[PDB]
Amino acid sequence: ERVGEKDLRAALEWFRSKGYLVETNKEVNPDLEITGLQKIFDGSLPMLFNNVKDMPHARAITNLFGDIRVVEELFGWENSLDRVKKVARAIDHPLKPVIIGQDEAPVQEEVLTTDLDVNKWLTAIRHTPLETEMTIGSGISCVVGPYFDGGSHIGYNRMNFRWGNVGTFQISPGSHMWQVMTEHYKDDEPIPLTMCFGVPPSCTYVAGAGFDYAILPKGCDEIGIAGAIQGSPVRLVKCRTIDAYTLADAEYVLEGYLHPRDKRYETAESEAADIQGRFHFHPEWAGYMGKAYKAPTFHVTAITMRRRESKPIIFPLGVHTADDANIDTSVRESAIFALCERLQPGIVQNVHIPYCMTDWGGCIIQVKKRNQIEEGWQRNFLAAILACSQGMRLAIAVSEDVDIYSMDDIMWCLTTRVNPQTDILNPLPGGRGQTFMPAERMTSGDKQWTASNTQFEGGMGIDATVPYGYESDFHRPVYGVDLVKPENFFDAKDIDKMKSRMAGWVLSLARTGR
Amino acid sequence: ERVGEKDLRAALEWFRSKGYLVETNKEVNPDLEITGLQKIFDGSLPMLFNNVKDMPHARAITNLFGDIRVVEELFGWENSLDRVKKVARAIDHPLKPVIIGQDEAPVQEEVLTTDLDVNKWLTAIRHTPLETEMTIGSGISCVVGPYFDGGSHIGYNRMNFRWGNVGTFQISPGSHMWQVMTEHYKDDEPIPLTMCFGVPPSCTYVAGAGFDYAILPKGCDEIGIAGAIQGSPVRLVKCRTIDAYTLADAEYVLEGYLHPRDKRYETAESEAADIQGRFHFHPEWAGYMGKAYKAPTFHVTAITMRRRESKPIIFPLGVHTADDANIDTSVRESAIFALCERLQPGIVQNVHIPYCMTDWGGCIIQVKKRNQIEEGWQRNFLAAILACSQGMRLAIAVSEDVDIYSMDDIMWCLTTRVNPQTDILNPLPGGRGQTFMPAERMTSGDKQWTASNTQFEGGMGIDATVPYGYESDFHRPVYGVDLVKPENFFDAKDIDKMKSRMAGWVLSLARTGR
Ligand SMILES: CC(C)(COP(=O)(O)OP(=O)(O)OC[C@H]1O[C@@H](n2cnc3c(N)ncnc32)[C@H](O)[C@H]1OP(=O)(O)O)[C@@H](O)C(=O)NCCC(=O)NCCSC(=O)c1ccccc1C#N
Ligand SMILES: CC(C)(COP(=O)(O)OP(=O)(O)OC[C@H]1O[C@@H](n2cnc3c(N)ncnc32)[C@H](O)[C@H]1OP(=O)(O)O)[C@@H](O)C(=O)NCCC(=O)NCCSC(=O)c1ccccc1C#N
Ligand SMILES: [Ca+2]
Ligand SMILES: [Ca+2]
Ligand SMILES: [Fe+3]
Ligand SMILES: [Fe+3]
Numbered sequence A, B: 001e002r003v004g005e006k007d008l009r010a011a012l013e014w015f016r017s018k019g020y021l022v023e024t025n026k027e028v029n030p031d032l033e034i035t036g037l038q039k040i041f042d043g044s045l046p047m048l049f050n051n052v053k054d055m056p057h058a059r060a061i062t063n064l065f066g067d068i069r070v071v072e073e074l075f076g077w078e079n080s081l082d083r084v085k086k087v088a089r090a091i092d093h094p095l096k097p098v099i100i101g102q103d104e105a106p107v108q109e110e111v112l113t114t115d116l117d118v119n120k121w122l123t124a125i126r127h128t129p130l131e132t133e134m135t136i137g138s139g140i141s142c143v144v145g146p147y148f149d150g151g152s153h154i155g156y157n158r159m160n161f162r163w164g165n166v167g168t169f170q171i172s173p174g175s176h177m178w179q180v181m182t183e184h185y186k187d188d189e190p191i192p193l194t195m196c197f198g199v200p201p202s203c204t205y206v207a208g209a210g211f212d213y214a215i216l217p218k219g220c221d222e223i224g225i226a227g228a229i230q231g232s233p234v235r236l237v238k239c240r241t242i243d244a245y246t247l248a249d250a251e252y253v254l255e256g257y258l259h260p261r262d263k264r265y266e267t268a269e270s271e272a273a274d275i276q277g278r279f280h281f282h283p284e285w286a287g288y289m290g291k292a293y294k295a296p297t298f299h300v301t302a303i304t305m306r307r308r309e310s311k312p313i314i315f316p317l318g319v320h321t322a323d324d325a326n327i328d329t330s331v332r333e334s335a336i337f338a339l340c341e342r343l344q345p346g347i348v349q350n351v352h353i354p355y356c357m358t359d360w361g362g363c364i365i366q367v368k369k370r371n372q373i374e375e376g377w378q379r380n381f382l383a384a385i386l387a388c389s390q391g392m393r394l395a396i397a398v399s400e401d402v403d404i405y406s407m408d409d410i411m412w413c414l415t416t417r418v419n420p421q422t423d424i425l426n427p428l429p430g431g432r433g434q435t436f437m438p439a440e441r442m443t444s445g446d447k448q449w450t451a452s453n454t455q456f457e458g459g460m461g462i463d464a465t466v467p468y469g470y471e472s473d474f475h476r477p478v479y480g481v482d483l484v485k486p487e488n489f490f491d492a493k494d495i496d497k498m499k500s501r502m503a504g505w506v507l508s509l510a511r512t513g514r
């Protein structure tokens, strides 16, 4: 029982074969060093640390999804558009997970039912020097079967184990875990779930999804979507101490129960002062320094893992990195594309959630109007995206003559193609927002800065598309960059010099001559 | 091959057994008499006309879905809420249709491949004296297989056969047929489809659906939904002259090809004057007198039907009737409920599209806020409903202490629970609307009054819910109608007199004592 099928170790072997893996044997400190090195090389190749300070049994990998190109190469996609379309198709066609025996699951080689000190086995890290606690943010929640209406859910939840085998469990209001906890908020028994660490890359990719429940509602099969993404079923295994299932090919597994009504503070400082929304926790998805809140507790009852001599791998990652941004926004883009295609097929050409747009904060859709009867569909798309993606603050629609991956080109569209009196939608003022946005959280006023007091401003949908029938007046003409060859005029040396001095919007403008 | 399984004849037998069927042998005139009698008994029991003027082979039934109570009894539902929930569940769990042999399909007992005069076999009717043409509005389009991405579509399309075997084909912009025609607008071959008449009641129920493509996108299985609604698979049969499938248990079937680029006028008058949007056609779904437009043509190549001595039944119905309203708004309500449940489960308690709200015009959702973190979800629901239901003009959200079926109670909520400065949403001004709404169609100005020139005003979402935490101040208290018994004070005669003098909002207020 020591082989993961399409597991993280196979991905590491593939990275090493492609030359995309950077290893080191120097001992890395989980306190400020892993996240520091990840931010120094933000959006770069994966880094594998063989020696982690005070964790002789663990290896740490980071920047696994830092470069979207290497991720697309790992999953067999040509480019971002191909990835979006293939992931939408996978969302509509899940692969049912397969259950294997308890004696052939690689993640159950070692089963610790006592001596449950999570912080001794799972690597907790500190992101910034301003933090006080070391937290665990590498595990994905896994709920399979009756508690998810016969489907399966996988997603990240940050945990702070400050009571040995009991830690806080951060749940986004409105998410799948929030819906499960709300349905069972007044039950007598706790919710049995497991946290998986070092899972297969497809499971991480699908766990990044969130707040796309018009496409991935409660009862869907997220593990099935991961299996369809990886081209084969994901293996499940029955837990040892609870009635649930786990990812058999993970590296660590925490079995336990979620107590919805047993809420405790995430940090000792906030627990002392007894207020939420202040007292920094660590950097969050909106790009701001974090805050600490009360949260339900996760009561661990068993710690399963691979053979400790094999040094099971854990994937710790800073929040404000290209890694986390890719992990969330990839399936977010695919789900937004699927929704727009459901509403009216053939109009949306591409969807992109750039790193700068705060994974749950905004998105960009590219629409192509084929005739006069399709004019106005971009506004329906913007309103539907803002309403079906809770707390999304800025959705932008652009035409097909726009480079959706260049923020400079988007800014140009905003400057030249937006009528400020009619092209700025504010669909749902007073709806549900995201508490982690400081602009929204500051609307609490003098109340507790939690989700119970914030007041959403309604989002912002910007229609920066060209009106149909005015494509000649809004034409970005072309420069003759294909009609002349620089080799006829200069030598290779000068051409390389001039090319090396180029960066930014000019790279996009020179490719298209636009 | 002469038995429909759960067909229209079985429904007629059930109605007769329950005493819900009203028969007559007097010859009814399809010109102004069928629709006149249907409007005289709007929302009443089904009427079966055994003798139709100039149609010795046809029987006509009307008001089949006129009373929602008899429909719910036919399909085995307790009430409207049970119907909505069961139909949502059926939408999420379709039954795959079964294919039967060409020699056991009841609808293929007689196959006319020549002498194709549709108006001689299919009963065309005139709705109002202001019309000039007699049109066919009893058949549902049926597209199965490759042209619907492996799914199945059923829906109504009004046809005017003024060229013998070639008639106009009215397609709503944005609908499933519109999406199919747009995908194949420039193909060389025409689109093979069939029009079914006198279909099973579940197929009519599902064909009533429209503009709910976040729940029923292109590629879904609408015939599967009908089968799940009726509790058994719907039978299909291979066509005779085209490569397609039809409802085997129908009464008539028109096989042919849809020519998207071969557009002709629906009436001779509009064809002469050569303008669209004027020159009345017949009453439409918005409750206004109709207009005539250009439309693609349906080229019939075969007319299959049951044995002409059995007098196959046809279901002609006026547009502005409780029948049509039920037929559309039932699955509309179920799909809106499904969408609201996908966005955030447990908040929406009931969805109702009243007759007065112009099937595609508006809806009412009833929300119950369980805690402070759910305040504001009604606005997300309203925005999502307005954006994902093309051209919807008025969505209203009310609290759980409201009778969703009483328009007086909704008006009371509008009067007392709407802040005009913050509770009226206008989410998507300039989006896609419905051309058949005169308020929208008048925005064309001096252009052609078609879908290419209308300018949607953005819809209207009214949040008439009670803010969370103010349920004591917005409490409709109760009167003690359960604490006193009228028999102790008056005799049965006076009680019946007083009860007979009551009607309207007082019936709802007296049941709840509110
Ligand atoms: C809002 C909340 C939780 C509430 O807590 P509070 O505002 O303090 O109010 P409350 O809970 O004490 O009272 C409440 C009363 O409503 C009843 N009630 C309460 N809940 C339920 C329920 N589920 N079902 C049924 N009834 C319920 C109770 O009946 C009663 O509570 P009880 O009396 O029973 O105790 C509040 O604490 C709170 O954490 N905000 C912030 C939470 C939040 O945005 N995370 C987002 C996580 S994204 C994230 O990281 C991330 C994502 C991507 C990338 C990087 C990162 C990072 N890096
Ligand atoms: C808007 C339309 C159709 C357009 O027609 P027009 O405005 O006149 O413009 P157009 O078609 O001539 O030109 C167009 C140009 O865009 C290109 N193009 C056009 N279409 C396509 C396409 N599908 N795919 C790709 N390209 C396309 C062509 O390339 C070029 O056309 P071409 O040059 O090729 O000919 C226009 O006629 C029209 O009927 N409005 C009204 C239609 C409408 O609301 N029904 C709603 C039916 S609910 C109903 O009853 C009902 C429902 C429930 C209950 C009761 C009732 C009743 N009782
Ligand atoms: Ca992205
Ligand atoms: Ca209705
Ligand atoms: Fe989930
Ligand atoms: Fe614009």
Ligand SMILES: [Fe+3]
Residues within 6 Å of the ligand: B152, B153, B154, B155, B176, B177, B222
């Ligand atoms: Fe359809």
Ligand SMILES: [Fe+3]
Residues within 6 Å of the ligand: B417, B418, B419, B423, B463, B464, B465, B466, B467
């Ligand atoms: Fe209100």
Ligand SMILES: [K+]
Residues within 6 Å of the ligand: A154, A155, A156, A206, A207, A208, A209, A210, A222
């Ligand atoms: K997820």
Ligand SMILES: [K+]
Residues within 6 Å of the ligand: B154, B155, B156, B206, B207, B208, B209, B210, B222
């Ligand atoms: K339909």
